[PDB]
Amino acid sequence: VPFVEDWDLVQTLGEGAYGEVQLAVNRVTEEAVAVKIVDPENIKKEICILKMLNHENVIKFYGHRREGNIQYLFMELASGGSLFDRIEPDIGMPEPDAQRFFHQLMAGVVYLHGIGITHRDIKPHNLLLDERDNLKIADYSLATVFRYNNRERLLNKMCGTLPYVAPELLKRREFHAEPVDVWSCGIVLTAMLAGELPWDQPSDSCQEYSDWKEKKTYLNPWKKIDSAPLALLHKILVENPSARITIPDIKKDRWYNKPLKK
């Protein structure tokens, strides 16, 4: 069919130091996708991880064209935008909606950890929503391999977003990849349930993190979170990453399994 190769760029979806993301619409079919446009070794690594992804809760990669030294990355479009924009400041969202998002988050993180990929920047800006509000883990530009040939490799690179980062990345030289992504999913949950972030970073100098370590859940944001999800957060936001709840045990948590949503 002539012209099915052609896509019109119709809306800006995001701009950063990386380049931009454009909503693209096929000239013939009207299929809508997201095109990440960049102006070397890093994009090479990113494309390689992007090709490994095939799950309903992770953004799908359709392939890439280079024109000149400009790379175009075609991927699944999520027409409902980011989870960030469903969170009402100081309120959060309804507990059933939050639980449903957290289920989908866990499904995508399980998936990634299964294929030996860590995301390293899980936050509501990187969690996108399709036309039916299904959650898609986006942005693989910090993702890396933590398991290959069934052997684990420890991480040392400091990266992510401070209010989301686990405390071991601030205190230890090396750390396991999986407890880091689990912690950031906890902060996601807190945000959905409270419409606020609990601390600037999880350090001994941050009074809001000390308050948590001392159990002062009569303070915000914790006082806004019902006892059942707050139990779960007590098991996720544990400072020692070796004692921190794993995903298989999150799937056994009372709140996680509570029926809430129609």
Side-chain angles (χ1 to χ4, degrees):
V1 178
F3 322 129
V4 190
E5 73 285 2
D6 288 346
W7 301 80
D8 299 315
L9 306 177
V10 161
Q11 171 181 37
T12 298
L13 301 178
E15 304 158 53
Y18 65 86
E20 57 190 285
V21 176
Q22 287 295 316
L23 194 169
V25 184
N26 185 267
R27 155 174 184 186
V28 170
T29 63
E30 297 180 53
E31 180 179 34
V33 298
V35 175
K36 179 188 177 142
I37 311 180
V38 335
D39 208 348
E41 247 165 48
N42 283 168
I43 62 87
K44 196 191 226 305
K45 177 168 190 185
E46 189 174 318
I47 290 166
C48 176
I49 291 170
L50 278 176
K51 290 176 181 181
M52 302 167 75
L53 312 179
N54 187 38
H55 181 278
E56 66 200 276
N57 298 121
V58 298
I59 289 290
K60 289 169 180 108
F61 186 52
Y62 301 145
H64 68 103
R65 256 122 76 170
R66 176 155 160 205
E67 282 178 32
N69 324 107
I70 308 307
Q71 281 286 354
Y72 295 86
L73 314 203
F74 290 80
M75 51 209 63
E76 186 176 1
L77 181 77
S79 56
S82 64
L83 177 66
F84 181 96
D85 293 327
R86 303 306 174 92
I87 298 169
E88 186 175 351
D90 218 42
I91 289 283
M93 69 184 66
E95 187 180 311
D97 293 346
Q99 187 199 56
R100 176 167 168 281
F101 289 143
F102 189 76
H103 291 155
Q104 295 176 348
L105 177 59
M106 288 300 96
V109 177
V110 174
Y111 169 79
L112 288 177
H113 288 175
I115 67 171
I117 303 303
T118 177
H119 186 277
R120 303 202 296 180
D121 206 16
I122 295 170
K123 56 178 186 177
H125 277 294
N126 286 338
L127 304 172
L128 313 174
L129 292 169
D130 81 3
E131 55 285 332
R132 298 194 276 294
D133 278 2
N134 303 116
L135 169 152
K136 304 282 179 167
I137 301 167
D139 199 344
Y140 290 87
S141 65
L142 287 181
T144 207
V145 169
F146 76 95
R147 196 196 302 109
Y148 195 78
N149 291 331
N150 195 27
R151 287 293 295 189
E152 180 169 15
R153 68 185 57 195
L154 301 172
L155 301 181
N156 68 72
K157 182 193 182 254
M158 272 169 107
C159 59
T161 303
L162 283 157
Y164 301 90
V165 69
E168 61 277 18
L169 173 159
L170 305 178
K171 293 159 167 153
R172 306 312 184 177
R173 191 173 68 80
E174 308 178 291
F175 38 89
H176 295 273
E178 292 168 300
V180 177
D181 285 331
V182 168
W183 177 285
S184 56
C185 289
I187 302 289
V188 172
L189 181 54
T190 306
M192 293 191 299
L193 294 172
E196 74 173 302
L197 302 173
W199 39 71
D200 286 344
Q201 45 183 111
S203 70
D204 278 286
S205 63
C206 180
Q207 175 71 75
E208 289 81 18
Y209 185 54
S210 297
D211 282 348
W212 174 249
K213 297 187 294 183
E214 290 162 23
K215 315 302 218 202
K216 311 188 166 148
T217 54
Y218 55 89
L219 298 177
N220 281 334
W222 313 116
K223 52 171 176 167
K224 305 174 192 187
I225 301 180
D226 176 72
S227 66
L230 188 62
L232 176 56
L233 289 163
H234 269 109
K235 293 185 292 193
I236 295 179
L237 303 175
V238 163
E239 187 173 356
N240 174 13
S242 312
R244 185 177 305 142
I245 196 160
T246 63
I247 308 191
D249 291 331
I250 290 182
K251 293 175 175 181
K252 307 172 207 219
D253 162 87
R254 193 170 94 278
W255 182 82
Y256 190 92
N257 286 285
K258 179 170 179 182
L260 288 177
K261 190 140 168 200
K262 252 77 160 106

